[PDB]
Amino acid sequence: AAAAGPEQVFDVGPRYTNLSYIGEGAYGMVCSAYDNLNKVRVAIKKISPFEHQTYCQRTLREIKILLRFRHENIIGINDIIRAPTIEQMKDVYIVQDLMETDLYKLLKTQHLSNDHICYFLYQILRGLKYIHSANVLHRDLKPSNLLLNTTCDLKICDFGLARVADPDHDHTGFLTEYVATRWYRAPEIMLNSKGYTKSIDIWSVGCILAEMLSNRPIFPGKHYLDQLNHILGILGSPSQEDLNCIINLKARNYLLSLPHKNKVPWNRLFPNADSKALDLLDKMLTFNPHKRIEVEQALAHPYLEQYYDPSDEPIAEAPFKFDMELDDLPKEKLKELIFEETARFQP
Numbered sequence: 117a118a119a120a121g122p123e124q125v126f127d128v129g130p131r132y133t134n135l136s137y138i139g140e141g142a143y144g145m146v147c148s149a150y151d152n153l154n155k156v157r158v159a160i161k162k163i164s165p166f167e168h169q170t171y172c173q174r175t176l177r178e179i180k181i182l183l184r185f186r187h188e189n190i191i192g193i194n195d196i197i198r199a200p201t202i203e204q205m206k207d208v209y210i211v212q213d214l215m216e217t218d219l220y221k222l223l224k225t226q227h228l229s230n231d232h233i234c235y236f237l238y239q240i241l242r243g244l245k246y247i248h249s250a251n252v253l254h255r256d257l258k259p260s261n262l263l264l265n266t267t268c269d270l271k272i273c274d275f276g277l278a279r280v281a282d283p284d285h286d287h288t289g290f291l292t293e294y295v296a297t298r299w300y301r302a303p304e305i306m307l308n309s310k311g312y313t314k315s316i317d318i319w320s321v322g323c324i325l326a327e328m329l330s331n332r333p334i335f336p337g338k339h340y341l342d343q344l345n346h347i348l349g350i351l352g353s354p355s356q357e358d359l360n361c362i363i364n365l366k367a368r369n370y371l372l373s374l375p376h377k378n379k380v381p382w383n384r385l386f387p388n389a390d391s392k393a394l395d396l397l398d399k400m401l402t403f404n405p406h407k408r409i410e411v412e413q414a415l416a417h418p419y420l421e422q423y424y425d426p427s428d429e430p431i432a433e434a435p436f437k438f439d440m441e442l443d444d445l446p447k448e449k450l451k452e453l454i455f456e457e458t459a460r461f462q463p
Contacts (some may be wrong), residue, residue: 128160128197128209129346129428133279142276143171147313148214151194152358158194160215170451173442174210174276179457181252181275189243191263191273192213196458205455215271219324220260223331230390232268233328238415238423239270240321247272250313250432251281255311256296256322259327260301278438282312290366291340293362298343304405306344307367315405318414322400329386329393351403352379358404392419 119127122137126147135151135434145164151158165171182193195211209278218234228236240262247254254261254275258461278314288310294301296311302319305311326334337343348354353376362368378456381393399409409417442450 117175126162126209127205129208131195132158132160132211151211156212157227159212160197161209161212162207163208165324166206166349166447166451169447169450172447172454173445176450176454176457177278177409177442178275179210179454180278180438183457184430185246185250187246187430188269189239189271190246191201191271195320198455198458200462202452202455205451208454208458212273213271214261215262215265218260219270219296219328220258221261222264223259223327227331228328230393233393234326234419235268235326235423236262236270237321237325239419240324241411241420242429244317244321245415245429246432247406248281248317248411250434252436253312253314254277254317254320256300257299257324258297259324262324262385279312280438281314281339285311286312287364290364290370295316298340299336301343301393302402302405303347303368305343307341307371308362308364309405313405314410316406317410318400319407320429321414322397325393329389329397329449334385347403348374348377350380350385351401352377354403359406361406365396390419395419401429 119125121127121134124134126135126145127134128149131152133152135147136149138145138146138148138159139322144164146159146161148157149160163171163175164443165175178198179193182191186192189214192209193210193212196210198207199205199209240257248337255277257272261272263271264431286309288308290307292310292414294311296307300320300323302309302311302316305316309316323334330458335343335346337346340350353374354371359368359371362371382397383391386394396409396414396417399417400414402408414420415429
């Protein structure tokens with residue numbers, strides 16, 4: 117009579133009973149379980165990250181942010197289970213609210229009414245307003261990072277690529293490599309941006325809105341440059357004014373080498389869509405990042421007027437800041453920090 121386990125080792129102690137296997141995404145296994153102290157069901161992710169410094173970094177980054185954020189539309193951490201000492205710590209179990217599906221799975225099977233689209237978009241932007249008010253960027257918004265329950269409450273998860281906004285350090289070269297999901301990448305990422313400003317998240321929300329309207333990705337590039345050619349195929353060739361903002365010579369001259377394309381109007385792509393939804397889509401999917409709509413303006417758009425209420429759309433109490441920088445640290449110091457962050461949940 118000892119440690120529990122389906123398929124392998126999943127020891128989660130006095131509190132959590134009645135496990136059932138759910139899947140294995142990026143790094144570690146997921147299971148449901150019965151929280152005895154609160155008498156609800158919950159999700160538990162086993163993370164085993166100490167053997168690769170990249171997983172350690174995403175794990176700490178995420179733990180710090182989620183512990184400080186407190187918002188209805190952002191996933192919480194209810195509990196963290198690890199060994200009592202640093203030498204015995206090989207795994208970490210993260211306990212979160214159980215959510216029945218996500219938007220990726222939902223869009224594979226269901227078509228959405230206009231009321232569902234409106235309300236889902238509202239909740240995304242309400243969550244995003246809070247994230248942006250703390251000066252944080254998500255950077256990997258996509259349908260599988262939007263979790264849903266059976267009553268249609270929406271929560272944003274997966275802050276593994278999140279960063280503090282830093283517009284003064286956004287510029288980079290043409291064709292610089294990028295880690296986030298290709299189909300939801302803003303055009304400036306392939307041209308001149310590292311993705312350190314708020315406008316990259318708004319682009320991704322734009323993509324998600326199009327996907328909710330039609331059940332398929334709007335810019336399904338097969339590789340790094342094909343992504344850019346999908347975008348230009350719909351939005352058309354950028355104007356002189358927009359081109360003059362791109363100082364980077366290699367990017368500008370690539371863009372000048374392409375044949376002229378006219379904008380495809382949105383109502384040709386989405387003939388059943390509400391007219392106000394297409395007007396918002398258009399302001400989100402703007403080629404120039406500086407003319408792209410901000411989160412507060414999107415919330416105040418007519419499409420969302422039955423929900424918009426700024427007194428019920430909280431902002432963070434203070435801006436978020438990493439004291440010390442996680443990109444320049446070895447896997448042994450990271451382990452020790454994960455240990456320290458997770459101390460408050462120890463009996």
